[PDB]
Assembly symmetry: C3
Homo-oligomer: 228 residues x 3
């Protein structure tokens, strides 16, 4: 198998969600944070031709940048990974799968309670601002008939009453009410545009970021409220 630049760029991102990964034969990759707050999946143009668990994904990816593009990666004789360059060979350890937390088989996302979208420059601003504003939690709600994302510094407003940052995502044509709360540390989507699919039922809730390359599903905090 071979890994194009796009595929390694995706893997580098999944590497920020979970340092390790479980690759399975086919053109689909997926991962989740050790604590299950964030999950991500993607169909890739490259094809994986064997099942292997890589404990240090970013390390593996770095080692692939030292080889040619047409490098041929395969399963080493002893069970590891073999990267064959024009005149050189690199062997990378394959880990026992028990040392890598991986997600269960993919299940279709439910039908959305609410739908909207976020543009690359806005996701970028949201993420960049959280650092300087000490924003560690955001809430997607409705104000004056438009979906908006408010940012708070929970450590010192617990009730999320003092909005420090506010972003308008467009108009809401629904009729329901909600204030879905997300933990900023879970927003690991790679930069780019995203369709935002909000889902809630009772005390269950999740936000899906459907992008052009991958999909990210993040959990809503217990404190979330709605009338769906």
């Amino acid at each position: 198998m071979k890994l194009s630049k796009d595929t390694t760029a995706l893997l580098k991102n999944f590497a920020t969600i979970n340092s390790g990964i479980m690759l399975k034969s086919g053109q689909f990759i997926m991962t989740r944070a050790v604590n299950g707050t964030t999950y991500a999946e993607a169909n890739i143009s490259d094809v994986i031709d064997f099942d292997v668990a890589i404990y240090d994904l970013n390390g593996f990816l770095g080692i692939l940048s030292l080889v040619n593009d047409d490098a041929e990666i395969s399963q080493s004789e002893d069970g590891n990974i073999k990267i064959a360059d024009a005149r050189s060979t690199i062997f990378w350890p394959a880990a026992d799968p028990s040392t890598v937390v991986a997600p269960n088989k993919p299940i279709p996302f439910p039908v959305a309670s609410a739908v909207t979208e976020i543009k690359a420059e806005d996701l970028q601003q949201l993420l960049r601002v959280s650092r300087g504003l000490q924003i560690d939690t955001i809430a997607i709600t409705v104000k004056e008939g438009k979906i908006v994302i408010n940012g708070f510094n929970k450590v010192e407003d617990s009730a999320l009453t003092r909005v420090k940052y506010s972003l308008t995502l467009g108009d809401y044509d629904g009729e329901n009410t909600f204030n879905f709360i997300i933990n900023m540390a879970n927003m690991k989507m790679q930069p780019g545009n995203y369709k935002l699919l909000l889902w809630a039922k009772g005390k269950q809730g999740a936000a899906k970021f459907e992008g052009e390359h991958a999909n990210y599903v993040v959990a809503l905090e217990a404190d979330s409220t709605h009338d769906f």
Copy 2:
């Protein structure tokens, strides 16, 4: 009000002098070190439309560098700062004036004892060499008919007797003799060319670096000598 890239760059330089600042409506900014050793002022092209004190100038400038150019900065509903964009909004705390040391009035430099200049490439060399040679104090004096700047490491040489770096500005046309001493920690001018105005009356003295947008006034140290 809208602040341009040129104005925020100056405010960023002023933040190295004092971490907080007091803005007054108009097109003039000035600040002073909390210990009162260095002063700075600048005329700006943008206009400030409301009076406001900012405790953490740097943090503020980091937040402005995240919103568009059109970003309008205004007096918030609850008396703080509002940074409005077309689709986003960021709030920032406005401090009580009393909690921010600031100059009460501009420092005029009506008279000079000596006038010289320092070119941008030479000021840059001075600063860099200083870091490399632990130079923490400089001395402006006359040497064989030339105005020069000598650099020393005060801790390893209390008599300011071992010059580690020497820079010639030009020849002196005066008739006086002097040795103006400056603590490098007070050389906060941003890069550029400067007219240098030196003044000393008895146990008094100060140096003014006149730039083509901001000026700096730093006090000479007590062990300075002169025949003025």
Copy 3:
């Protein structure tokens, strides 16, 4: 004396071998690591017109990068170093040879047992991979009529049995058997192409990397083997 950019670049690389150096009148420089494991030398195109020991080479070279290349480096009135250009003078300390471990004399590298080469690209990858794979020791040997370098992780594999990296240098037109072991920490040659000269007698052994700018000599580890 005036040091051109190519001499300072070489001097900067020797500094990674031994933080200090002993310069001597002539057109030749050399140095050896404090623990005596690696030796380096080179012919330079500038003339060093006087003996001087430099305790902090990197610092010195940094200083030299703040003045014009036309800078005159001379023996200070009091034994130290004086660097001077158009309008500025910098003084750098000369060290007592006692505080600097320098080589004694270029002992002629013996006839070689075997000879090969390593292209710049290969060398770079060897170093880059060694870091990513934590390869602390390499082995130069013959495999299928070819000279090859195998990298191991000696702390995690004492017997040097599991190759983690392998590079092909070229075919061995000779007919001897050898397994020359080198400690990665001694591979300090600056980047470029090199002629590899390997030599061994009994329990004696060393490798000389012959480059166009400079030459590096590194000893072989005790565990090396050969029938030369």
